[PDB]
Coordinates of C-alpha atoms and ligand atoms in Angstrom, one line a residue:
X1 CA 16.1 -27.4 -42.3
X2 CA 12.4 -28.9 -41.8
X3 CA 12.1 -29.7 -37.8
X4 CA 11.9 -34.1 -39.9
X5 CA 15.1 -33.6 -41.8
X6 CA 17.0 -31.8 -39.1
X7 CA 16.2 -35.4 -36.5
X8 CA 17.2 -37.2 -39.7
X9 CA 21.3 -36.4 -39.3
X10 CA 20.5 -35.9 -35.9
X11 CA 19.7 -39.5 -35.4
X12 CA 22.7 -40.4 -38.6
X13 CA 24.8 -38.0 -37.2
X14 CA 25.1 -39.4 -33.6
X15 CA 25.0 -42.9 -35.1
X16 CA 28.1 -42.6 -37.3
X17 CA 29.7 -40.3 -34.9
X18 CA 28.7 -43.5 -32.4
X19 CA 30.4 -46.0 -35.6
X20 CA 33.2 -44.3 -36.2
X21 CA 34.2 -43.5 -32.4
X22 CA 33.9 -47.8 -32.0
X23 CA 35.3 -47.5 -35.6
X24 CA 38.2 -46.3 -34.0
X25 CA 39.4 -46.6 -29.6
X26 CA 38.1 -50.4 -30.1
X27 CA 37.7 -51.7 -33.5
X28 CA 41.4 -49.8 -34.9
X29 CA 40.1 -49.2 -38.2
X30 CA 38.9 -46.2 -38.8
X31 CA 37.9 -45.0 -42.2
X32 CA 37.9 -41.8 -42.2
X33 CA 40.1 -38.9 -40.6
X34 CA 41.0 -38.1 -37.0
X35 CA 40.0 -34.4 -38.6
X36 CA 37.2 -35.0 -41.0
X37 CA 35.8 -36.6 -37.9
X38 CA 35.3 -34.1 -35.7
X39 CA 33.7 -32.5 -39.0
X40 CA 30.4 -34.7 -38.0
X41 CA 30.5 -34.1 -34.4
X42 CA 30.9 -30.6 -34.2
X43 CA 27.7 -30.2 -37.4
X44 CA 26.0 -32.4 -34.5
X45 CA 26.1 -29.7 -32.7
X46 CA 24.9 -27.0 -34.7
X47 CA 22.4 -28.4 -35.2
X48 CA 21.3 -29.5 -31.8
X49 CA 21.6 -25.4 -30.2
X50 CA 18.9 -23.8 -33.6
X51 CA 16.4 -27.1 -32.5
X52 CA 17.5 -27.9 -28.4
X53 CA 14.2 -30.7 -28.2
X54 CA 16.5 -33.2 -30.2
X55 CA 19.6 -32.4 -27.4
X56 CA 19.5 -36.1 -26.0
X57 CA 22.0 -36.9 -22.8
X58 CA 22.4 -39.4 -25.4
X59 CA 24.4 -37.4 -28.3
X60 CA 27.6 -37.6 -28.5
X61 CA 28.5 -34.3 -27.7
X62 CA 27.2 -34.8 -24.0
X63 CA 30.2 -35.8 -23.2
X64 CA 33.1 -35.1 -26.0
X65 CA 36.2 -35.5 -26.8
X66 CA 39.3 -37.8 -27.6
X67 CA 38.3 -39.8 -25.3
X68 CA 36.4 -43.6 -26.1
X69 CA 32.7 -41.9 -26.3
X70 CA 30.5 -44.3 -23.6
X71 CA 27.0 -45.0 -22.9
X72 CA 24.9 -42.7 -20.7
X73 CA 22.8 -45.3 -17.9
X74 CA 20.1 -43.0 -18.3
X75 CA 16.8 -44.9 -17.4
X76 CA 14.6 -44.8 -20.7
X77 CA 11.2 -45.5 -21.2
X78 CA 10.2 -47.3 -24.2
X79 CA 8.3 -46.5 -27.1
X80 CA 5.7 -49.7 -26.1
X81 CA 6.0 -51.4 -22.6
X82 CA 7.8 -55.0 -22.6
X83 CA 6.2 -57.4 -20.8
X84 CA 7.9 -61.1 -19.1
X85 CA 5.6 -64.1 -19.9
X86 CA 4.3 -66.9 -17.2
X87 CA 6.1 -69.5 -16.4
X88 CA 5.0 -73.7 -16.9
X89 CA 6.7 -76.3 -15.3
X90 CA 4.1 -79.3 -16.5
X91 CA 2.5 -81.1 -19.6
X92 CA -0.9 -80.2 -17.3
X93 CA 0.3 -76.1 -17.4
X94 CA 0.3 -75.7 -21.1
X95 CA -2.1 -77.4 -21.2
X96 CA -4.5 -75.5 -19.0
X97 CA -3.0 -72.7 -21.3
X98 CA -3.9 -73.9 -24.7
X99 CA -6.9 -74.7 -23.1
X100 CA -7.7 -70.9 -21.3
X101 CA -7.3 -70.5 -25.3
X102 CA -9.9 -72.4 -26.1
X103 CA -11.7 -69.8 -25.0
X104 CA -12.9 -67.7 -27.9
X105 CA -12.5 -71.6 -30.0
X106 CA -12.9 -72.0 -34.1
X107 CA -13.7 -75.8 -33.7
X108 CA -9.9 -77.2 -32.4
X109 CA -8.2 -77.0 -29.7
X110 CA -4.3 -77.9 -31.3
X111 CA -3.3 -74.4 -32.0
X112 CA -0.2 -74.1 -34.4
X113 CA 2.5 -72.7 -32.2
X114 CA 6.3 -71.5 -32.7
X115 CA 8.3 -72.5 -30.7
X116 CA 12.1 -71.5 -29.9
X117 CA 14.6 -71.8 -27.1
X118 CA 14.8 -70.0 -24.0
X119 CA 18.1 -67.3 -24.2
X120 CA 19.4 -67.7 -21.0
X121 CA 20.3 -63.4 -21.5
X122 CA 19.0 -59.8 -21.2
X123 CA 16.0 -58.5 -22.7
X124 CA 17.0 -55.2 -25.1
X125 CA 14.7 -52.8 -26.5
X126 CA 16.3 -50.8 -29.7
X127 CA 15.0 -48.0 -31.1
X128 CA 15.0 -47.1 -35.0
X129 CA 14.0 -44.7 -36.5
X130 CA 14.0 -43.7 -40.5
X131 CA 15.5 -47.6 -39.6
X132 CA 18.3 -45.9 -38.0
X133 CA 19.6 -46.6 -34.8
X134 CA 18.2 -44.1 -32.6
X135 CA 19.4 -45.8 -29.1
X136 CA 19.0 -49.8 -27.6
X137 CA 17.8 -49.6 -24.2
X138 CA 18.3 -52.6 -21.4
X139 CA 15.1 -53.8 -20.9
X140 CA 15.2 -52.7 -17.0
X141 CA 11.6 -53.0 -15.1
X142 CA 10.3 -53.2 -18.7
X143 CA 8.8 -49.7 -19.0
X144 CA 11.8 -47.6 -18.9
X145 CA 15.8 -49.1 -18.9
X146 CA 18.6 -47.9 -18.8
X147 CA 19.8 -46.6 -22.2
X148 CA 23.4 -48.5 -23.3
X149 CA 23.7 -47.9 -27.3
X150 CA 27.3 -47.9 -27.4
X151 CA 28.0 -51.3 -25.8
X152 CA 25.5 -52.8 -28.2
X153 CA 27.8 -51.5 -31.4
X154 CA 30.3 -53.4 -29.9
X155 CA 28.3 -56.8 -31.0
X156 CA 28.7 -56.4 -34.6
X157 CA 25.5 -58.8 -35.1
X158 CA 23.4 -55.9 -34.1
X159 CA 22.6 -54.0 -37.3
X160 CA 22.9 -50.3 -37.7
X161 CA 21.0 -49.6 -40.7
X162 CA 17.9 -51.2 -41.5
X163 CA 15.8 -51.2 -44.9
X164 CA 11.9 -51.5 -45.8
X165 CA 11.5 -51.4 -42.9
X166 CA 8.7 -48.3 -40.7
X167 CA 9.4 -45.5 -40.0
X168 CA 9.2 -46.1 -36.1
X169 CA 10.3 -49.9 -35.1
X170 CA 11.3 -51.1 -32.2
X171 CA 12.8 -54.3 -32.7
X172 CA 13.6 -56.4 -29.3
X173 CA 15.7 -59.9 -28.4
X174 CA 18.2 -60.2 -25.8
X175 CA 22.6 -60.1 -25.6
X176 CA 23.9 -62.9 -23.8
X177 CA 27.4 -64.8 -23.2
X178 CA 28.1 -68.4 -24.9
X179 CA 29.3 -70.8 -21.6
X180 CA 32.0 -70.7 -23.3
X181 CA 33.2 -66.9 -23.0
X182 CA 30.7 -67.0 -19.5
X183 CA 33.5 -69.7 -18.3
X184 CA 36.6 -67.8 -19.8
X185 CA 35.1 -65.0 -18.4
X186 CA 35.1 -66.3 -15.2
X187 CA 38.4 -68.0 -15.0
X188 CA 39.8 -64.8 -15.2
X189 CA 37.7 -63.4 -12.2
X190 CA 38.8 -65.9 -9.5
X191 CA 43.1 -65.7 -10.9
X192 CA 42.8 -61.5 -10.9
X193 CA 40.6 -62.3 -6.8
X194 CA 36.8 -60.9 -7.9
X195 CA 33.5 -62.5 -7.0
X196 CA 32.5 -64.7 -9.9
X197 CA 29.6 -64.4 -11.6
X198 CA 27.3 -67.2 -11.2
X199 CA 25.0 -66.8 -14.5
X200 CA 24.8 -66.4 -18.6
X201 CA 22.7 -63.9 -17.4
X202 CA 24.2 -61.6 -14.7
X203 CA 27.4 -62.0 -17.0
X204 CA 26.4 -60.9 -19.9
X205 CA 24.6 -57.0 -17.9
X206 CA 27.9 -56.7 -16.9
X207 CA 30.5 -56.6 -20.1
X208 CA 28.0 -54.7 -21.3
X209 CA 27.3 -52.3 -18.2
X210 CA 30.9 -50.9 -18.7
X211 CA 31.3 -47.3 -18.9
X212 CA 34.3 -48.0 -21.7
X213 CA 32.7 -49.9 -24.1
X214 CA 36.5 -51.3 -24.8
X215 CA 35.7 -53.5 -22.3
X216 CA 32.7 -55.1 -23.6
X217 CA 34.5 -55.9 -27.1
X218 CA 36.4 -58.2 -25.3
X219 CA 33.9 -60.1 -23.6
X220 CA 31.9 -62.2 -25.5
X221 CA 28.6 -61.0 -25.9
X222 CA 26.0 -62.3 -28.7
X223 CA 22.9 -61.0 -29.7
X224 CA 19.5 -62.5 -31.2
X225 CA 16.0 -60.9 -31.9
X226 CA 12.4 -62.4 -31.5
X227 CA 9.8 -59.6 -31.5
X228 CA 9.2 -56.8 -32.8
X229 CA 6.7 -53.1 -30.7
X230 CA 6.4 -50.4 -32.6
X231 CA 6.6 -51.8 -36.0
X232 CA 4.3 -55.0 -35.2
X233 CA 1.3 -53.6 -38.4
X234 CA 3.6 -52.1 -40.3
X235 CA 5.8 -54.7 -41.1
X236 CA 3.1 -56.3 -43.0
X237 CA 4.0 -59.7 -40.3
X238 CA 1.5 -62.4 -39.9
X239 CA 3.1 -65.0 -38.0
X240 CA 5.4 -65.4 -35.5
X241 CA 7.3 -67.1 -37.8
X242 CA 7.7 -65.2 -40.0
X243 CA 8.8 -61.9 -37.6
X244 CA 12.0 -64.4 -37.2
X245 CA 12.6 -64.9 -40.3
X246 CA 11.6 -61.2 -42.0
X247 CA 14.1 -60.6 -38.1
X248 CA 17.1 -62.3 -39.7
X249 CA 16.4 -60.7 -43.3
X250 CA 17.1 -57.3 -41.9
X251 CA 20.3 -58.1 -40.0
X252 CA 19.1 -59.2 -37.0
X253 CA 20.8 -61.4 -35.8
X254 CA 18.1 -65.1 -35.2
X255 CA 20.5 -66.7 -33.4
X256 CA 18.3 -69.1 -30.9
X257 CA 16.6 -71.9 -32.5
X258 CA 12.6 -72.3 -33.5
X259 CA 10.6 -74.4 -34.9
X260 CA 6.5 -75.1 -35.1
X261 CA 4.6 -77.1 -33.6
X262 CA 0.4 -78.2 -33.3
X263 CA -1.1 -78.5 -30.1
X264 CA -0.3 -78.2 -26.9
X265 CA 0.9 -82.2 -27.1
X266 CA 3.0 -81.5 -29.9
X267 CA 4.4 -78.6 -28.1
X268 CA 5.3 -81.4 -25.7
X269 CA 7.4 -82.7 -28.3
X270 CA 9.6 -79.8 -29.2
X271 CA 10.6 -79.5 -26.1
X272 CA 11.9 -82.8 -24.7
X273 CA 13.9 -83.0 -28.2
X274 CA 15.3 -79.3 -26.9
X275 CA 15.6 -80.9 -22.6
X276 CA 18.0 -83.3 -24.6
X277 CA 20.3 -80.5 -26.3
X278 CA 20.2 -78.7 -22.4
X279 CA 23.4 -79.0 -23.0
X280 CA 24.4 -79.4 -26.5
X281 CA 23.8 -75.2 -27.1
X282 CA 26.4 -72.8 -27.4
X283 CA 24.7 -70.9 -24.6
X284 CA 22.3 -72.6 -21.4
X285 CA 18.5 -72.0 -22.1
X286 CA 16.7 -73.2 -19.6
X287 CA 13.4 -73.5 -21.0
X288 CA 11.1 -73.2 -24.9
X289 CA 9.0 -70.4 -25.5
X290 CA 5.1 -71.2 -26.3
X291 CA 4.0 -67.9 -29.0
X292 CA 0.6 -68.9 -30.6
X293 CA 1.8 -68.4 -34.5
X294 CA -0.9 -66.1 -35.0
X295 CA 0.0 -62.7 -34.2
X296 CA -3.2 -60.9 -35.7
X297 CA -4.9 -63.4 -33.0
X298 CA -3.0 -61.8 -31.0
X299 CA -4.4 -58.6 -30.8
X300 CA -7.6 -60.3 -28.7
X301 CA -6.1 -62.2 -26.6
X302 CA -4.4 -59.2 -23.9
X303 CA -1.7 -58.8 -21.3
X304 CA -2.7 -60.0 -17.5
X305 CA -1.0 -57.2 -15.8
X306 CA 2.4 -58.2 -16.7
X307 CA 2.1 -60.7 -18.9
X308 CA 0.3 -62.4 -22.3
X309 CA -1.9 -64.5 -22.8
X310 CA -0.7 -66.1 -26.4
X311 CA 2.6 -66.8 -25.0
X312 CA 4.4 -69.1 -22.4
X313 CA 7.3 -70.0 -21.1
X314 CA 7.6 -73.8 -20.5
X315 CA 10.4 -74.4 -18.4
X316 CA 13.1 -77.4 -18.0
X317 CA 13.7 -78.6 -14.2
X318 CA 14.8 -76.5 -12.2
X319 CA 18.8 -78.4 -11.3
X320 CA 19.1 -77.5 -7.4
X321 CA 19.3 -79.0 -4.4
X322 CA 20.5 -78.9 -1.0
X323 CA 23.6 -80.8 1.1
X324 CA 26.4 -80.2 4.0
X325 CA 29.5 -79.1 3.3
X326 CA 31.7 -80.9 5.1
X327 CA 35.3 -80.3 5.2
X328 CA 37.2 -78.4 2.7
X329 CA 40.7 -79.1 0.7
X330 CA 43.1 -77.0 -1.1
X331 CA 44.8 -77.1 -3.7
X332 CA 47.3 -75.1 -6.3
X333 CA 47.1 -73.5 -9.6
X334 CA 49.8 -73.9 -12.6
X335 CA 50.8 -70.2 -11.6
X336 CA 50.4 -70.6 -7.7
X337 CA 46.6 -69.6 -7.0
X338 CA 46.0 -71.9 -4.2
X339 CA 42.7 -72.4 -4.6
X340 CA 39.6 -74.2 -2.4
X341 CA 37.4 -76.7 -2.9
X342 CA 34.7 -77.8 -0.8
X343 CA 34.0 -81.7 -0.3
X344 CA 30.1 -81.9 0.1
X345 CA 28.0 -84.8 0.6
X346 CA 27.4 -87.0 -2.2
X347 CA 24.3 -85.1 -3.4
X348 CA 22.5 -85.2 -6.7
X349 CA 21.8 -82.9 -10.1
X350 CA 20.5 -84.6 -13.5
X351 CA 21.3 -88.6 -12.2
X352 CA 26.0 -86.9 -12.4
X353 CA 26.8 -87.6 -8.7
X354 CA 28.2 -84.4 -7.4
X355 CA 30.6 -84.5 -4.4
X356 CA 33.4 -82.0 -4.3
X357 CA 32.8 -78.7 -5.9
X358 CA 34.7 -75.5 -6.1
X359 CA 35.0 -72.9 -3.7
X360 CA 36.9 -70.2 -6.3
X361 CA 39.4 -67.9 -4.1
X362 CA 38.4 -66.2 -0.9
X363 CA 36.2 -63.6 -2.0
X364 CA 33.5 -66.4 -3.6
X365 CA 33.9 -67.5 -0.2
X366 CA 33.3 -64.6 1.6
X367 CA 31.1 -63.4 -0.2
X368 CA 28.5 -65.9 0.9
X369 CA 29.9 -66.3 3.5
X370 CA 30.5 -70.2 3.4
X371 CA 31.7 -71.3 6.6
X372 CA 31.7 -75.7 7.2
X373 CA 29.3 -77.3 9.3
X374 CA 27.5 -75.3 6.8
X375 CA 23.9 -77.0 4.7
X376 CA 24.1 -75.4 1.2
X377 CA 22.0 -75.3 -1.7
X378 CA 24.1 -76.2 -5.0
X379 CA 23.5 -75.9 -8.7
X380 CA 25.1 -75.1 -12.1
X381 CA 26.1 -72.0 -13.1
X382 CA 25.8 -72.1 -17.0
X383 CA 24.5 -75.7 -16.2
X384 CA 27.8 -76.9 -16.3
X385 CA 29.4 -76.4 -13.6
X386 CA 28.4 -76.4 -10.1
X387 CA 29.0 -74.4 -7.7
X388 CA 27.0 -73.2 -3.6
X389 CA 24.7 -71.3 -5.3
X390 CA 23.9 -70.3 -2.1
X391 CA 24.1 -71.1 2.2
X392 CA 21.6 -72.2 4.3
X393 CA 22.1 -70.0 6.9
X394 CA 19.4 -70.2 9.4
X395 CA 20.0 -73.8 9.6
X396 CA 23.2 -73.0 11.0
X397 CA 24.3 -75.1 14.6
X398 CA 26.0 -72.6 15.3
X399 CA 29.3 -74.8 15.2
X400 CA 30.2 -74.7 11.3
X401 CA 34.6 -73.7 11.2
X402 CA 35.6 -70.6 9.3
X403 CA 37.2 -70.9 5.8
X404 CA 40.9 -70.7 6.5
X405 CA 43.9 -71.8 3.6
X406 CA 46.3 -73.1 5.3
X407 CA 50.0 -71.9 6.4
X408 CA 52.1 -73.4 3.9
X409 CA 51.3 -74.7 0.4
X410 CA 50.6 -78.2 0.3
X411 CA 53.4 -79.1 -2.9
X412 CA 56.2 -78.3 -2.1
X413 CA 55.7 -77.0 1.6
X414 CA 56.7 -73.1 1.1
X415 CA 54.9 -71.1 3.0
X416 CA 51.9 -69.0 1.9
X417 CA 51.8 -65.7 0.7
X418 CA 49.2 -62.9 0.2
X419 CA 50.0 -61.3 -3.1
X420 CA 46.8 -59.2 -3.6
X421 CA 43.2 -61.2 -3.0
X422 CA 44.5 -64.5 -3.6
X423 CA 46.3 -66.7 -1.3
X424 CA 49.7 -68.2 -3.4
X425 CA 52.5 -69.8 -3.5
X426 CA 56.0 -67.4 -3.5
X427 CA 58.2 -70.2 -4.2
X428 CA 60.0 -69.9 -7.6
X429 CA 60.2 -73.6 -7.7
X430 CA 57.5 -74.8 -5.7
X431 CA 56.6 -78.0 -8.9
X432 CA 52.7 -77.1 -9.2
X433 CA 53.7 -73.6 -11.0
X434 CA 57.1 -75.5 -13.3
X435 CA 54.8 -75.7 -16.9
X436 CA 54.5 -72.3 -16.8
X437 CA 57.5 -70.9 -15.9
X438 CA 59.2 -72.5 -18.5
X439 CA 57.3 -70.8 -20.8
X440 CA 56.5 -67.6 -19.4
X441 CA 60.6 -67.9 -19.6
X442 CA 60.5 -69.2 -23.2
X443 CA 58.2 -66.0 -24.8
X444 CA 59.5 -64.1 -26.9
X445 CA 58.6 -61.6 -24.1
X446 CA 62.1 -63.5 -22.3
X447 CA 64.1 -65.3 -23.1
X448 CA 62.5 -66.1 -26.5
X449 CA 63.0 -70.2 -27.2
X450 CA 60.6 -70.8 -29.8
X451 CA 61.5 -74.4 -29.9
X452 CA 59.9 -74.8 -27.0
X453 CA 56.3 -75.7 -27.5
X454 CA 53.8 -75.9 -25.3
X455 CA 53.9 -79.9 -26.3
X456 CA 57.5 -80.4 -26.1
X457 CA 57.5 -78.2 -23.0
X458 CA 54.6 -80.4 -21.0
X459 CA 56.4 -83.8 -22.1
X460 CA 60.1 -82.6 -21.3
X461 CA 58.5 -82.5 -18.3
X462 CA 56.9 -85.2 -17.5
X463 CA 59.9 -87.2 -19.0
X464 CA 62.0 -86.1 -16.4
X465 CA 64.2 -83.8 -18.8
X466 CA 63.5 -80.8 -17.1
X467 CA 62.2 -79.3 -13.7
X468 CA 62.9 -75.2 -14.5
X469 CA 64.1 -72.9 -16.1
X470 CA 67.8 -73.8 -15.9
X471 CA 67.7 -77.6 -16.8
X472 CA 67.1 -75.9 -19.9
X473 CA 70.7 -75.9 -20.8
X474 CA 71.6 -79.4 -19.4
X475 CA 69.8 -80.7 -22.6
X476 CA 72.1 -80.2 -24.5
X477 CA 72.1 -83.7 -25.2
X478 CA 70.2 -83.7 -28.4
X479 CA 70.6 -87.7 -27.8
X480 CA 67.5 -85.9 -25.1
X481 CA 65.3 -83.9 -27.7
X482 CA 65.8 -87.4 -30.1
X483 CA 62.5 -89.0 -28.8
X484 CA 59.7 -87.3 -29.3
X485 CA 58.6 -86.5 -33.3
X486 CA 62.5 -85.1 -32.8
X487 CA 65.4 -86.0 -35.1
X488 CA 68.3 -84.0 -35.4
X489 CA 66.8 -82.2 -38.3
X490 CA 64.6 -80.9 -35.1
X491 CA 66.9 -80.8 -32.3
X492 CA 70.1 -79.6 -33.3
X493 CA 67.4 -76.8 -34.2
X494 CA 66.1 -76.0 -30.8
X495 CA 69.6 -76.9 -29.2
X496 CA 71.2 -73.3 -30.8
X497 CA 67.9 -71.8 -29.8
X498 CA 68.3 -72.5 -25.7
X499 CA 71.7 -71.0 -26.1
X500 CA 72.0 -68.4 -28.3
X501 CA 68.7 -67.3 -25.0
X502 CA 71.8 -67.3 -23.1
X503 CA 72.7 -63.7 -24.0
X504 CA 69.3 -61.7 -23.5
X505 CA 70.0 -58.9 -20.9
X506 CA 69.4 -58.6 -17.5
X507 CA 66.0 -57.3 -18.8
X508 CA 64.5 -59.7 -20.5
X509 CA 66.1 -62.1 -17.9
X510 CA 64.0 -60.2 -15.0
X511 CA 60.8 -60.6 -16.5
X512 CA 60.9 -64.6 -18.0
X513 CA 61.9 -65.5 -14.8
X514 CA 58.5 -63.7 -13.1
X515 CA 58.8 -61.8 -10.1
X516 CA 56.3 -60.0 -7.8
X517 CA 54.9 -57.4 -10.6
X518 CA 58.5 -56.8 -11.9
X519 CA 56.2 -56.3 -15.5
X520 CA 58.0 -56.1 -19.5
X521 CA 59.2 -52.3 -18.1
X522 CA 59.2 -52.9 -14.6
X523 CA 61.9 -55.0 -15.6
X524 CA 64.1 -53.2 -18.0
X525 CA 64.0 -50.2 -15.1
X526 CA 65.1 -53.1 -12.5
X527 CA 67.9 -53.9 -15.1
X528 CA 69.3 -50.4 -15.5
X529 CA 69.5 -49.2 -11.8
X530 CA 71.6 -52.3 -10.7
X531 CA 73.5 -53.8 -13.6
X532 CA 73.9 -57.2 -12.9
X533 CA 71.8 -59.3 -10.8
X534 CA 73.9 -59.9 -7.8
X535 CA 73.9 -56.1 -7.2
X536 CA 70.1 -56.8 -7.5
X537 CA 70.6 -59.8 -5.3
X538 CA 72.2 -57.5 -2.8
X539 CA 69.0 -54.8 -2.8
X540 CA 67.6 -53.3 -0.4
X541 CA 64.1 -52.1 0.3
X542 CA 65.5 -47.8 0.1
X543 CA 66.9 -49.1 -3.2
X544 CA 63.6 -50.4 -4.5
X545 CA 61.3 -48.5 -3.7
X546 CA 63.6 -45.1 -5.5
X547 CA 62.7 -47.2 -8.5
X548 CA 60.2 -45.8 -11.7
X549 CA 56.8 -47.8 -10.8
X550 CA 57.9 -49.5 -8.0
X551 CA 55.5 -48.9 -4.8
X552 CA 56.0 -50.5 -1.2
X553 CA 54.0 -53.4 -1.2
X554 CA 55.8 -54.6 -4.4
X555 CA 59.0 -53.7 -3.4
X556 CA 59.3 -55.5 -0.5
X557 CA 58.0 -58.5 -2.1
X558 CA 60.3 -59.1 -4.3
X559 CA 62.8 -58.5 -1.8
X560 CA 61.6 -61.4 0.0
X561 CA 61.7 -63.4 -3.1
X562 CA 65.5 -62.4 -3.9
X563 CA 66.1 -63.4 -0.6
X564 CA 64.4 -66.9 -0.9
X565 CA 67.0 -69.0 -0.6
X566 CA 64.5 -71.2 -3.9
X567 CA 65.4 -68.0 -5.9
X568 CA 69.4 -67.9 -5.4
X569 CA 69.3 -71.3 -6.2
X570 CA 67.4 -71.1 -9.6
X571 CA 69.5 -68.0 -10.3
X572 CA 71.9 -69.8 -9.1
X573 CA 71.8 -72.6 -10.9
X574 CA 71.4 -70.0 -14.6
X575 CA 74.0 -67.7 -14.5
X576 CA 77.1 -71.3 -14.1
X577 CA 75.4 -72.1 -17.7
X578 CA 76.5 -68.8 -19.1
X579 CA 73.2 -66.6 -18.6
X580 CA 74.8 -63.1 -18.8
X581 CA 73.0 -61.1 -15.4
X582 CA 74.0 -58.1 -16.9
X583 CA 71.7 -55.3 -19.1
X584 CA 72.5 -56.1 -22.9
Ligands
LIG1 N1 13.3 -66.4 -27.2 C1 12.5 -66.2 -26.6 N2 11.2 -65.2 -27.2 C2 10.5 -64.2 -26.0 N3 10.8 -64.3 -25.1 C3 12.0 -64.1 -23.8 C4 13.0 -65.2 -25.4 N4 14.1 -65.7 -24.4 C5 14.2 -65.0 -23.0 N5 12.8 -63.8 -23.2 C6 12.1 -63.3 -22.3 O1 13.4 -63.6 -21.0 C7 13.0 -64.3 -19.5 C8 13.3 -65.5 -19.8 O2 13.3 -66.0 -18.8 P1 14.0 -67.6 -18.0 O3 15.0 -67.4 -18.0 O4 12.9 -68.3 -17.7 C9 11.5 -64.7 -19.8 O5 10.8 -63.8 -19.2 C10 11.8 -64.2 -22.0 O6 10.7 -63.4 -21.5
LIG2 ZN1 54.5 -74.7 -3.8

């Protein structure tokens, strides 16, 4: 086969193989065979050896198997260089800018531009040959970036096969995480006790820089594209505006908004119409980008040491302000995690007066070394949630006090317990955990109670009919369930579930009362070994370790809950209502 051809199949093979390793270990909806699949992974290795030149530590081969095809974070120089824009913060600049362009002119100044939102994300490069996606790397330093093609496949919008494009195409855009996701990812991290991201750029970086591409897919990652590299001239594009439309038609996703505008003045118009939607977008945007619209006049205009001249970045005012951290108070979540809250000196960020800010968890406070008396620079993560961006250390009077959790839980009085990287309340009955408790217990994985809708649980909790798990069985009085959208067509029905659930066995019962670590499997492995709550309640450290997957750390934990009077109490009241305490 002609050296040229070999390249193509090599380009294609590696793709189909990345696509299907994805279509498999990721999506779980493979099309081809798990065997006919290796019938390609082999041929890839056949051409790679009879044309050694094409070997690339990117190829599926370099690390094959029946494992998730990972992305080699190997450094890669991009076909063309990727630049950064210069920053303007006032209309004077951007006037001056368009003025700088006047150096040439042609009976004007009002210059047609294309203005678009500034996607707070990470620049990515996507090289394509004959249309096929060869690789996709991060911006890195503008010249060499990390290879991360696999992860770029977890984003369904990034196209793999173009059509009618230049033999060599280098399309550039960005990959980002929407505030909802950003915020979601940040919530799951606080609970685990990890340090949370301070913004959508970083949070997008990591979510893409994961060995296991299966992870990048659960993160929200979205990508948009706005520029070409090797290919401008090839494409026949003339206007920036057309570019974005061309880019769209080809299968590339272009989601950040854009529009035309004439002369600084006009640009300055879109700017504000934008600055007003600065928090109305499904993603954080810290400014906009003024791009001269005539691509033809891009060449004459050059790039400085590290920036273009035909384009510019007009950024929104930076919302950052210094203030002091005065006191810090604690709260307890629905899971038990005792959260930290910093009470700052009343300050201002966009008119909204900030006075109470989340610490996060103990990690954040530790990482940023956030003491008390400390002066802190507070910002808005994602431009939506204020948080101490960093402490102004040098200004430390040296008399600041270190943040320490309290001995007890402020919402029930029970002594606290450090279950991992975050402090929490072991109390089985702490009022702060009722809703979560009642629900977990009601899940099909638990004592399966389909009637208890998330709304009824908080309705039964607010109206005082319930307080904990046992109370469910004393709701017998349907007279009780007949005042919250239920009649007796609806009552009697649920009433029998709170009954039938009495019969789920000790296994499922142990899982319902959420013990420290006792997972669905750790629970069953617990019921089998004790037959009854009574027995278990008399379990010993040793007896507990001896169990499959019960480690010393969790053993000594379960051991303390079990002895807790509250737990005892809750259990008794459940037995005394007919809930079976034996293995089913
Ligand atoms: N829509 C866009 N068009 C061109 N470049 C962008 C766009 N969005 C982000 N960038 C790049 O990403 C960086 C974001 O900067 P910002 O955050 O202050 C800039 O240096 C830009 O070069
Ligand atoms: Zn508590």
